[PDB]
Design a protein around this nucleic acid. Sequence first.
DNA 1: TAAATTCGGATTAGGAAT
DNA 2: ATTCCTAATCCGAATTTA
Length: 352
Amino acid sequence: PIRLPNPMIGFGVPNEPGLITHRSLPELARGPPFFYYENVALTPKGVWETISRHLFEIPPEFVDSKYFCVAARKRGYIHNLPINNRFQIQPPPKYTIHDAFPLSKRWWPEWDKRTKLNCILTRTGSAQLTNRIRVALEPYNEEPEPPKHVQRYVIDQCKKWNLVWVGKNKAAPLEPDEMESILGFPKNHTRGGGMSRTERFKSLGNSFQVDTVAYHLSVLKPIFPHGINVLSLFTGIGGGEVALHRLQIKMKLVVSVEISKVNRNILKDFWEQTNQTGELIEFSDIQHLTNDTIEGLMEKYGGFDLVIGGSPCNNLAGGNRVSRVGLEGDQSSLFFEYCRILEVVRARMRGS
DNA sequence: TAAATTCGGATTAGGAAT
DNA sequence: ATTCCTAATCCGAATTTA
Ligand SMILES: Nc1ncnc2c1ncn2[C@@H]1O[C@H](CSCC[C@H](N)C(=O)O)[C@@H](O)[C@H]1O
């Protein structure tokens, strides 16, 4: 049974001990293409063992993004990239709550000892929870500190719902632009394209932490001095694309597969606003992308150097009350479509 | 009717006690 | 073993707003 590393540093993270410069991959895992697969680390039992079984028995690299920003993000990455001489994109985001939320020291209690936030999700705290916390605290405003039991309730709720102190006895969730920034996207990346505030919350919650992914992908920069062709599966708001952009790795071509219209609009807006000279091709449903469409695209553009994606985690995530049925859930079973498309790419690039 | 809102525990792992 | 705690966690369904 796969056991999560503690600390969850993968093969090493910046500013920490334990950097590992070499691993040995099964020969079946050898590129081309390079691939990069992502999903949540905290799955039902047996999930990552199965995912590794279908990705050539590559052990996952489990990394918590608290080593890259202020918010935790425990993810598993199966990839066949070299792991020596990674570098981080600069400047790295703010590391602590104090620096990431400069105004918050005005409102932050002595007895809230947090210095990191927890994982950014698709559901945030309600206005009613903020009220319940405010009401619980006011009877003690003239006293220097509320009793220990009301303290622990507020702490337990601030952690459960990833709240920050914004006003007098006011603990509120993160705003979309704060999530964007902590996830390493440029400001306003997800505003526009027809995307509602509600949809911004959801797409940000599902996304990559760009600095974590970029640090992994940085080894590609010396390999491809002339840029890469990219097959982006479950593209989302384009975390993998923003990472390559921040790495100054030219994207000659990106074939993107993303079923959300507003997500595809966010990616096209990014493509135009950053003045990408390459070509963006947008597909919608991965289940309707045929093997021979892939093969035709590779014949036209010369194959794919990188296949990157993160299949849905709906049915794996601990926040799902209703349908956390594991890897064969209606959404998460799309992992096997990632595998199907990846095998088509491998068939052309490496043979058999 | 798009958008916003609020509510709803279980699965894991680990540490510390038996 | 068990027992008992703390602890984190890319969420769905239903309803209400505007
Ligand atoms: N059938 C399907 N075909 C293509 N994409 C799908 C799909 N079903 C779900 N998806 C998409 O898969 C994505 C998984 S979330 C991954 C997002 C990405 N890592 C980022 O940087 O944002 C979601 O955006 C979801 O819309």
